Design an enzyme around this catalytic site. Sequence first.
Site, PDB file in Angstrom:
ATOM      1  N   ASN A  46     -10.045  51.075  28.338  1.00 20.23           N
ATOM      2  CA  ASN A  46      -8.882  51.556  29.078  1.00 20.23           C
ATOM      3  C   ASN A  46      -9.119  52.928  29.648  1.00 20.23           C
ATOM      4  O   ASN A  46      -9.937  53.670  29.137  1.00 20.23           O
ATOM      5  CB  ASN A  46      -7.696  51.557  28.113  1.00 20.23           C
ATOM      6  CG  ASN A  46      -7.395  50.145  27.544  1.00 20.23           C
ATOM      7  OD1 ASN A  46      -7.258  49.941  26.331  1.00 20.23           O
ATOM      8  ND2 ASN A  46      -7.273  49.214  28.412  1.00 20.23           N
ATOM      9  N   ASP A  48      -7.440  55.533  29.306  1.00 23.42           N
ATOM     10  CA  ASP A  48      -7.049  56.557  28.362  1.00 23.42           C
ATOM     11  C   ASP A  48      -8.141  56.748  27.300  1.00 23.42           C
ATOM     12  O   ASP A  48      -7.990  57.572  26.457  1.00 23.42           O
ATOM     13  CB  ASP A  48      -5.635  56.288  27.789  1.00 23.42           C
ATOM     14  CG  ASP A  48      -5.596  55.201  26.722  1.00 23.42           C
ATOM     15  OD1 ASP A  48      -6.480  54.343  26.700  1.00 23.42           O
ATOM     16  OD2 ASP A  48      -4.758  55.232  25.823  1.00 23.42           O
ATOM     17  N   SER A  50      -8.953  54.493  25.037  1.00 20.44           N
ATOM     18  CA  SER A  50      -8.764  53.427  24.032  1.00 20.44           C
ATOM     19  C   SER A  50      -9.558  52.199  24.542  1.00 20.44           C
ATOM     20  O   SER A  50      -9.985  52.119  25.686  1.00 20.44           O
ATOM     21  CB  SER A  50      -7.317  53.061  23.848  1.00 20.44           C
ATOM     22  OG  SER A  50      -6.747  52.498  24.998  1.00 20.44           O
ATOM     23  N   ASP A 101       7.113  44.486  16.531  1.00 20.90           N
ATOM     24  CA  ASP A 101       7.294  45.935  16.708  1.00 20.90           C
ATOM     25  C   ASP A 101       8.553  46.257  17.513  1.00 20.90           C
ATOM     26  O   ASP A 101       8.972  47.413  17.554  1.00 20.90           O
ATOM     27  CB  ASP A 101       6.091  46.528  17.445  1.00 20.90           C
ATOM     28  CG  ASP A 101       6.030  48.020  17.382  1.00 20.90           C
ATOM     29  OD1 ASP A 101       6.021  48.575  16.256  1.00 20.90           O
ATOM     30  OD2 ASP A 101       5.979  48.640  18.477  1.00 20.90           O
TER      31      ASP A 101
END
Length: 129
Positions: A46, A48, A50, A101
Site C-alpha cells: 500500500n 502508506d 502497510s 469490527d
Amino acid sequence: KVFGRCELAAAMKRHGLDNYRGYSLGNWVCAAKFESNFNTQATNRNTDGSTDYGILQINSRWWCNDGRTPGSRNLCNIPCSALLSSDITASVNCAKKIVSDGNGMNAWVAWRNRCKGTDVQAWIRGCRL
Ligand SMILES: [Cl-]
Ligand SMILES: [Cl-]
Ligand SMILES: [Cl-]
Ligand SMILES: [Cl-]
Ligand code: NA
C-alpha cells in the site's frame, strides 16, 4: 497455494465463515477471488507502507505484524506470514475479527466495489458443500 473455487468454499465453510456475521459463503468466495485470485501467497504493498497478505488481503496497519509498518497494530496477534500459508485457518480467524469490527465486509474495499449488491451466491453454485 492457488485454491479452486469450490475447494475454497469448502475450506471456508469448514472454518465457520458461511453466514459469519450474517455474510453468506458466496460473499467470502467473491472477496477472495478479487482480492487474491484465490492465491494464499498474494501480497500487495500500500502507499502508506502497510502490506496486504494472503487470500483475503489482510492489512498490516491493524491486523498482523510484519515488522515494517510503523505505528501499526497486530490485533489478530499473528505474523503476517501466517496469512500466506496453504492452510487458511489464520486468514479465516483474522477475517472473523475484522468483520466483527463494526463495518462488516465493507472493511474489504474490493468486496464493497465488486461483490456488494451482486449475485454472490453464483460463487458457490455447482459446489458440493
Ligand atoms: Cl452465498
Ligand atoms: Cl517483527
Ligand atoms: Cl511493524
Ligand atoms: Cl454487517
Ligand atoms: Na502490524
